Amino acid sequence: EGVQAFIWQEFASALEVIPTTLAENAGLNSIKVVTELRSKHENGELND
Amino acid sequence: NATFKNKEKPQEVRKANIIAARSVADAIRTSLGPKGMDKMI
Amino acid sequence: KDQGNKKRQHGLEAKKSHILAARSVASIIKTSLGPRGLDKILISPDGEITITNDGATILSQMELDNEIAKLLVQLSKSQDDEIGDGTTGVVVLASALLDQALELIQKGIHPIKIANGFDEAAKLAISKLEETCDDISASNDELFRDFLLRAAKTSLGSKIVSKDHDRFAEMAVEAVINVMDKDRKDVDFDLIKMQGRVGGSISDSKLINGVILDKDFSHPQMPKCVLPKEGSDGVKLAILTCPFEPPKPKTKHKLDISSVEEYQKLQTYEQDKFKEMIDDVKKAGADVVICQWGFDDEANHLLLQNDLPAVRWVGGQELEHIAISTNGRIVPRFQDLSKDKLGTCSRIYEQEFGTTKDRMLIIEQSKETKTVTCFVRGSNKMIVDEAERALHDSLCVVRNLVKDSRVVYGGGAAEVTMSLAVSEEADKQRGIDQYAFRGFAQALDTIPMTLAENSGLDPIGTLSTLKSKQLKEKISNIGVDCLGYGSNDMKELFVVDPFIGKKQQILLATQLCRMILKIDNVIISGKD
Amino acid sequence: QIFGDQVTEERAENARLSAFVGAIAVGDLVKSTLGPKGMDKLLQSASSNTCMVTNDGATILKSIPLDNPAAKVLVNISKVQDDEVGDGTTSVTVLSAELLREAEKLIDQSKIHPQTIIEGYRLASAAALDALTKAAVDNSHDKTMFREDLIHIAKTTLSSKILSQDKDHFAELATNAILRLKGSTNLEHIQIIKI
Amino acid sequence: IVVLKEGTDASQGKGQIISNINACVAVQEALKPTLGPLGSDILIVTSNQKTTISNDGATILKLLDVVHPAAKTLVDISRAQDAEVGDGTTSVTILAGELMKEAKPFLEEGISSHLIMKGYRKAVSLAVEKINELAVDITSEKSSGRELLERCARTAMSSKLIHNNADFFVKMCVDAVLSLDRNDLDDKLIGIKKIPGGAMEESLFINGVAFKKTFSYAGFEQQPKKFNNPKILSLNVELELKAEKDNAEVRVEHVEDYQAIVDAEWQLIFEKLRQVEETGANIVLSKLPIGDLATQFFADRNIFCAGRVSADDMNRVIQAVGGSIQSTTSDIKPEHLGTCALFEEMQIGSERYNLFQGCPQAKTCTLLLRGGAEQVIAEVERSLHDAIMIVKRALQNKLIVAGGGATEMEVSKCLRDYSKTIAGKQQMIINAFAKALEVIPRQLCENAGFDAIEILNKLRLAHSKGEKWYGVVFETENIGDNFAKFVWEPALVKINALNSATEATNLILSVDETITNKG
């Protein structure tokens, strides 16, 4: 509740920078990579 | 309603520092990973 | 053609420029959202100063050279008739959607995918609203009428008429009942005429069951009233469109008298025509003569001698209103006039409002009719304008409520519920759909935040508290303090917005967002 | 570009700055004229052949052109004083300017919409009016003379009317209907039965 | 003492050609988002401040009218294509822009424009030959000018109520368009009537026009129900014992005079009814009710009559039978009489329905639908309307080629293959033209939000083997056989578009200098 929820949401959104940078440097589509990772995480936690 | 006056303007300095730090971070970002781009200085 | 002084944007700055223009347009009325929205000063080119917070009025009077802003304003002009009171909310929602689309594009999402995802999110939000809607008409007729009156009073209270707004709400409800039937549950605003003038007070409002026809009866000696004649069959109206004069040349005329023979011939012709017309009127049995055109001096004298008050220059729509109210028919000519086509009305008398000395003529039925006129008065032009706007808003709200029994509650509670549902559904759909749903939910979050800001509350804390209350405990109608309220949970405060109104707001916002996003190239020529 | 004909909406910051400061500046035109010991102000025409000096706040406000829309709005709203009382326009303008200045100072200390400021001003005005009503005194001593004057006025007004049938009776009725109320004299407190 | 150039000169040679190429590139970029049904719209504000948002290429070109001479030539060619064909204007502009882009590097390398134009002409010839080869016109492959229409109708009715029974409705839909002028097709010429009763598979196809019962006066079922040599004649206002039109109110104070007047009018009507027979009108139709006297006379004379015919039905019947409408009986002429092979009343649905059959020369037809409920017949009618529209569109251009870039991919592949056997300088131009032809699928994918690079690579890999109908699927991002999905474009339209684009390219590239005179 309060500003804490918004700041935590912003922190979580910022946490996705690392995979985005890895996808960009690897020549892969950032959106595709992040969507596939999130979809696969429905079953896995860290191995994907 | 009534809140803090905020007479001073530390926001200018804070935003300038944030902009400089973000520029440096963006410059360093492209080197992440095995396929990271090389930097020449 | 007109290549010089031609500007265009495409490929690099088109999307950013369009989104920034839309945001700038929205910021004009963003602070005016809600009943306590801040007012804006609008000044005519002649120097007339007016104060109002109506977003539709602010945008309608604003002209600009920006193409995206012009398109947004034009769309809002058309939407003003569809909803009226939701223009500011739709504009704000569209601006928030465009702001989110900016970030989505910055992430590499094509505009078409953004539009499709926004459409899907709007569908999901409408489904959630339908699921969470409540029925008032299906619960109790007394409660339904109470809610209609409450909505009318809420609409009226934002203006100066709040002192005695009950009369306006009652008149609006009576007009809706008289004009609207339950077969279609749609109010025909064309049959609800809005008329008024500066003067009097807010208590002079009156609902008329027919046309006004504030005419001077042409001849000074012509009687200004048509009495029921002590219990007679009301007043018989001669609905005519042919002018009450003989045919005349259109080139020279100058039918002067030079000798006895010409005088005799011209008098014979003119008197024969006038006598034919007046005899037809008398045989028809009409008590009052109504013509689409004026009357000649001889016609006026004959009507005065026969005690036949005359009405001059009645418009086609006025003639249709006369026919509807009096159950009559329009007769093209005098020769076609008969008792079988005359209309009947209770009386045609002069009515005084407050201190007004005009003594305007009004046609009254005193019975249920399919056409009515909402008469509005006030001590100032601003009062009259605000009263008319509030009456229009109340009529639209009543029409929406009657059309669909499902209703939602204001104060952003519906927006918060839709945002929560969209956020929950976003994690279930993979791909660009997740980003689109998250953006749509964030855009929906804008409305409650704007309302809180306009009310002096912190949008962040207010929105977080609303989400917590609507998620951890249960789904309810909890909004922001738009007005002075003891607490939250509008459900107990009786702040109700029609379900159809909210659905139309969401659909129009989505359509406007698609229209702005789907334009990827703008070309404007010079000016002469 | 928005609107046109030199009538365009100003930036929010500058718009609010104008709305407050320009409206407050109207008081400075009449602040020096407040009270019987006020100063004089010189109004000069373009030709300089019709310049005059006056200490009337209403004349100063209505004669000096005001380009800022906020000043126009303030003057138009304050004009109600002339119709209601016909005097004290200077005091109304000065008080409005001071209230606007205080509200501007509060906003500079809060940077939040003045709706709460409006509510606070409403409450303070209600309290001040209640105190003023409490502090008022009555000079209506010898109410018998006032009743006689009311009877005479009623008789004067009833002339040439249908009520002239019993002038004294109707004058007494009218005088009683006002005197015996011991409060508001509005027509809503007086009922007329027509039979 | 008069100067037109105001002392301003201009260069000539490859520089002006490159400037024209740049102008064409600007025009192509401007019109790029409008390509394809999924393309974006363009907002244009005229000198009068009128704002128009549209996606059609012709409207955009008319509103813009770029003053640049190369852009003027492109606009003129696009307008010519739109006027002569009306389809492919945007594609023509895009192809011309792409060809101009490809020509730029050749000019930069010193290649004369004449060689480029000759190579483009040769590539156009090869592309036309390959499109003609790819064009589908088959009989023995279970498809033809009629069987293909049946397949299209079945596809249109797919996932519908009558999908399982499409085997019979496809024939009706195809015959509806084929039963009238094949060079002039119109949906308004294919009517549908709903008759309750019977199975949906029992629906009847009527070559002529049919309508429900409209006669409800004396003599019903007392007149012939079948005609082998019918004569259809529409008489406007007679068929009554008393005049209906242009009549007057007559008041008579004596019984004898009124009776005499009525008898005279009846005798006049008797003479008119006799003349009706004398005119050889075996079928009498009218939009107004027919009296008992006329029906009795016609029944006694073996003549069929039916009044209260709706205007649309009467007009359709007249057009199908080739007759006309006569104001009076005395003015009936033989040239106004229509004839069909057989006219009869159908008893399906516990009611008699009039229909004209065996009239191949009819300009319109009617479909008779059967079913157990009105809702089922309504669904059948909707499916039949969809199938009729689809088959009409298919028949308007029977010569078809695979759509969704399949034709472009095939032409590009063929040109690339030929370039290996055209050894010489023309190889570069052939390869450039083949690459340019691939712009259409690229821009279509880009406007649709698809991954243009991946889709193009997959399409190129796939087209090298298998069928020649592989293209881009715009419903779900993928590639596949568009022809199997019933997605195609006219071959003639594509050929005309390519010809127009190449003509524009040759015209613009053939200009070395432009001179403008003040005026």
Swiss-Prot record, chain A:
Subcellular location: Cytoplasm
Quaternary structure (record): Heterooligomeric complex of about 850 to 900 kDa that forms two stacked rings, 12 to 16 nm in diameter.
Similarity comment: Belongs to the TCP-1 chaperonin family.
Other comments on record: Present with 5530 molecules/cell in log phase SD medium.
Known role: Molecular chaperone; assists the folding of proteins upon ATP hydrolysis. Known to play a role, in vitro, in the folding of actin and tubulin. In yeast may play a role in mitotic spindle formation.
Protein name: T-complex protein 1 subunit delta
UniProtKB/Swiss-Prot annotation, chain C:
Transmembrane segments: none
Keywords, alphabetical: ATP-binding, Chaperone, Cytoplasm, Nucleotide-binding
GO biological process: chaperone mediated protein folding independent of cofactor; protein folding
Compartment(s) where it occurs, according to its Swiss-Prot or TrEMBL record: Cytoplasm
Pfam families named among the record's database cross-references: Cpn60_TCP1
Primary location group: cytoplasm
Any single GO CC term annotated in Swiss-Prot or TrEMBL for this entry: chaperonin-containing T-complex
Subunit structure: Heterooligomeric complex of about 850 to 900 kDa that forms two stacked rings, 12 to 16 nm in diameter.
Function: Molecular chaperone; assists the folding of proteins upon ATP hydrolysis. Known to play a role, in vitro, in the folding of actin and tubulin. In yeast may play a role in mitotic spindle formation.
Family: Belongs to the TCP-1 chaperonin family.
NCBIfam families, alphabetized: chap_CCT_epsi, thermosome_alpha, thermosome_beta
Protein name: T-complex protein 1 subunit epsilon
UniProt source species: Saccharomyces cerevisiae (strain ATCC 204508 / S288c)
Classification of source organism: Eukaryota, Fungi, Dikarya, Ascomycota, Saccharomycotina
Name of the gene this protein is made from: CCT5
UniProtKB/Swiss-Prot annotation, chain D:
Coiled-coil boundaries: none
Subcellular location: Cytoplasm
Primary role: Molecular chaperone; assists the folding of proteins upon ATP hydrolysis. Known to play a role, in vitro, in the folding of actin and tubulin. In yeast may play a role in mitotic spindle formation.
Assembly with partners or alone: Heterooligomeric complex of about 850 to 900 kDa that forms two stacked rings, 12 to 16 nm in diameter. Interacts with PLP2; this interaction leads to inhibition of CCT complex mediated actin folding.
Family: Belongs to the TCP-1 chaperonin family.
Descriptive protein name: T-complex protein 1 subunit beta
Protein encoded by which gene: CCT2
From Swiss-Prot, chain E:
Subunit structure: Heterooligomeric complex of about 850 to 900 kDa that forms two stacked rings, 12 to 16 nm in diameter.
Superkingdom field: Eukaryota
PANTHER family found in the cross-reference section: CHAPERONIN
One GO BP: protein folding
Subcellular location field: Cytoplasm
GO molecular function: ATP binding; ATP hydrolysis activity; ATP-dependent protein folding chaperone; unfolded protein binding
Name under which the protein is recorded: T-complex protein 1 subunit eta
Pfam family, one: Cpn60_TCP1
SUPFAM superfamilies: GroEL apical domain-like, GroEL equatorial domain-like, GroEL-intermediate domain like
Membership in a protein family: Belongs to the TCP-1 chaperonin family.
Keyword Chaperone: yes
Keyword field: ATP-binding, Chaperone, Cytoplasm, Nucleotide-binding
InterPro entries attached to this UniProt entry: Chap_CCT_eta (IPR012720), Chaperone_TCP-1 (IPR017998), Chaperonin_TCP-1_CS (IPR002194), Cpn60/GroEL/TCP-1 (IPR002423), GroEL-like_apical_dom_sf (IPR027409), GROEL-like_equatorial_sf (IPR027413), TCP-1-like_intermed_sf (IPR027410), TCP-1_chaperonin (IPR053374)
Cellular component annotations (GO), alphabetically ordered: chaperonin-containing T-complex; cytoplasm
NCBIfam families according to UniProt: chap_CCT_eta, thermosome_alpha, thermosome_beta
Free-text function comment from the UniProt entry: Molecular chaperone; assists the folding of proteins upon ATP hydrolysis. Known to play a role, in vitro, in the folding of actin and tubulin. In yeast may play a role in mitotic spindle formation.
Presence of the UniProt keyword Chaperone in the record: yes
